[PDB]
Amino acid sequence: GMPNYKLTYFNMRGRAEIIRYIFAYLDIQYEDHRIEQADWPEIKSTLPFGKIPILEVDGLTLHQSLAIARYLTKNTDLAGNTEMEQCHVDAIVDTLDDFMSCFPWAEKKQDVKEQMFNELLTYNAPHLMQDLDTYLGGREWLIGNSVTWADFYWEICSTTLLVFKPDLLDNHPRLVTLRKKVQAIPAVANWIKRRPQTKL
Amino acid sequence: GMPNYKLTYFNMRGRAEIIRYIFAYLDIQYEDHRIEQADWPEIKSTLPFGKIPILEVDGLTLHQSLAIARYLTKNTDLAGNTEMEQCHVDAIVDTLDDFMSCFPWAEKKQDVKEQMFNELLTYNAPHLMQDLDTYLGGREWLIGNSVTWADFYWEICSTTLLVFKPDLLDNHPRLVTLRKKVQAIPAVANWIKRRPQTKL
Numbered sequence: 001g002m003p004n005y006k007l008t009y010f011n012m013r014g015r016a017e018i019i020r021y022i023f024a025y026l027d028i029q030y031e032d033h034r035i036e037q038a039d040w041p042e043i044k045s046t047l048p049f050g051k052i053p054i055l056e057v058d059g060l061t062l063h064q065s066l067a068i069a070r071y072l073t074k075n076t077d078l079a080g081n082t083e084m085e086q087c088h089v090d091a092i093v094d095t096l097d098d099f100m101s102c103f104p105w106a107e108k109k110q111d112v113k114e115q116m117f118n119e120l121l122t123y124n125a126p127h128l129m130q131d132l133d134t135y136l137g138g139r140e141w142l143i144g145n146s147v148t149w150a151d152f153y154w155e156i157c158s159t160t161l162l163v164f165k166p167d168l169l170d171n172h173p174r175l176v177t178l179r180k181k182v183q184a185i186p187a188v189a190n191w192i193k194r195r196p197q198t199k200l
Numbered sequence: 201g202m203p204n205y206k207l208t209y210f211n212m213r214g215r216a217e218i219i220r221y222i223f224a225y226l227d228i229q230y231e232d233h234r235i236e237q238a239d240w241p242e243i244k245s246t247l248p249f250g251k252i253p254i255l256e257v258d259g260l261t262l263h264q265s266l267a268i269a270r271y272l273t274k275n276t277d278l279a280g281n282t283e284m285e286q287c288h289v290d291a292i293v294d295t296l297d298d299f300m301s302c303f304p305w306a307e308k309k310q311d312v313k314e315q316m317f318n319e320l321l322t323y324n325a326p327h328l329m330q331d332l333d334t335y336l337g338g339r340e341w342l343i344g345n346s347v348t349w350a351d352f353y354w355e356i357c358s359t360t361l362l363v364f365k366p367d368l369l370d371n372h373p374r375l376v377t378l379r380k381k382v383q384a385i386p387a388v389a390n391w392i393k394r395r396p397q398t399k400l
């Protein structure tokens with residue numbers, strides 16, 4: 001039968017949400033294991049590397065959110081439809097992840113953390129939004145003729161950015177339309193209704 | 201027909217080197233276009249997301265070094281020998297890239313830059329080296345029974361780290377052995393002999 005899938009991450013959307021969307025879209029059953037921050041050192045001690053999310057697939061522990069997402073979407077409708085499309089999917093996702101990963105999520109000094117979030121959102125985020133809008137143009141989805149997991153990743157990253165900067169897309173209605181289209185995909189809409197509500 | 205490839209990056213190994221290794225290994229002819237930092241301000245607006253490397257292929261523009269590397273290795277013996285091993289390849293590459301991407305390559309204040317390079321090399325690089333070494337164990341390659349582009353990426357990243365900290369691997373003979381194996385692969389050895397000599 002199907003594998004036993006167990007996703008481990010914090011009780012946040014964060015870096016695990018892309019995998020959660022993929023499982024929902026593919027209608028694949030999984031255990032959505034959410035740990036408290038206090039229990040990270042114990043979990044970490046059991047892993048080959050030093051980060052979450054990780055995905056157990058039967059007896060195998062996978063790591064790296066995008067490596068996992070790519071694996072789960074291979075040979076599904078969420079992959080790019082062609083080899084080149086798969087390159088473009090990968091590139092857009094890495095561009096989004098690169099930007100999200102610039103935020104000092106783990107900075108313990110709160111004043112330093114807030115200053116850097118504000119700088120990134122005020123002076124850098126608009127340039128990424130403009131690059132993404134130009135890249136999308138008048139097309140329905142970011143890559144090819146149908147939805148890919150890059151579209152999911154756009155909606156996920158932008159949801160978190162909008163928490164901190166609600167007017168991020170005021171000048172980019174086409175990027176708003178794309179978010180709404182992802183959110184209206186039935187399996188995604190259903191997951192959004194039912195998922196734990198967390199800030200991040 | 202023979203493909204028309206043009207790689208654009210700075211005159212450094214940097215983030216383009218993985219692509220250069222793959223082109224060498226696959227016997228692919230390409231234009232290795234190297235810009236100087238003084239060319240950057242005028243090239244930036246031509247780039248899809250404001251970053252290099254980019255790769256032009258038969259009139260199309262690709263970006264994101266690892267997206268490009270993955271695209272070039274699909275259907276080659278560098279990709280990973282099973283779908284699950286391709287996931288492992290991808291995860292190792294992202295773990296390496298995540299670490300290299302922590303370094304403040306573009307920091308202006310040189311004292312701030314040096315402090316952070318030293319901190320990362322002292323208190324974070326040892327954990328990565330230990331985790332990689334334990335993952336490799338007694339195996340010949342990082343993933344599977346033959347070389348993959350993750351092994352290439354290990355050698356590339358560690359070569360640069362060793363510029364700053366020559367002693368970094370003195371306690372990890374198995375990781376040194378793996379570097380030397382990559383460096384002796386005929387295509388790689390010959391590329392190393394002929395490539396432009398740059399610090400980074």
Ligand SMILES: CC(C)(O)[C@H]1CC[C@H](NC(=O)c2ccc3nc(-c4ccccc4)cn3c2)CC1
Nearest residue numbers: 012014015037040097100101105106156157200
């Ligand atoms: C246990 C510990 C070491 O103290 C951890 C330190 C990191 C922290 N982590 C965050 O607080 C966080 C929250 C939200 C979030 N979202 C992204 C994101 C989203 C989409 C794409 C890429 C990245 C990264 N994030 C990190 C969680 C605790």
Ligand SMILES: CC(C)(O)[C@H]1CC[C@H](NC(=O)c2ccc3nc(-c4ccccc4)cn3c2)CC1
Nearest residue numbers: 212214215237240297300305306356357360400
């Ligand atoms: C002109 C400008 C906008 O100011 C640029 C800002 C970035 C800087 N960039 C570096 O100076 C640099 C040097 C070496 C290097 N090596 C990696 C590396 C290597 C292996 C794997 C992943 C990353 C990244 N690097 C960046 C070059 C100038």
Ligand SMILES: N[C@@H](CCC(=O)N[C@@H](CS)C(=O)NCC(=O)O)C(=O)O
Nearest residue numbers: 014015050051052053064065066298
């Ligand atoms: N590129 C990795 C990044 C993973 C990552 O940074 N995870 C953070 C949680 S948001 C983590 O595990 N931090 C714990 C630590 O650094 O000890 C991925 O997407 O999986």
Ligand SMILES: N[C@@H](CCC(=O)N[C@@H](CS)C(=O)NCC(=O)O)C(=O)O
Nearest residue numbers: 098215250251252253264265266306
């Ligand atoms: N993850 C991207 C990162 C690309 C990147 O940041 N490249 C640097 C050159 S080392 C760049 O374009 N910097 C331009 C800038 O800092 O404004 C990739 O691997 O292609």
Ligand SMILES: [Cl-]
Nearest residue numbers: 386387390391
């Ligand atoms: Cl040769």
Ligand SMILES: [Mg+2]
Nearest residue numbers: 077079080081
């Ligand atoms: Mg598809």
Ligand SMILES: [Mg+2]
Nearest residue numbers: 094097294297
């Ligand atoms: Mg990355």
Ligand code: NA
Nearest residue numbers: 098101298301
């Ligand atoms: Na990154």
Ligand code: NA
Nearest residue numbers: 134135136248
């Ligand atoms: Na474009």
Ligand code: NA
Nearest residue numbers: 179180183184
């Ligand atoms: Na909506």
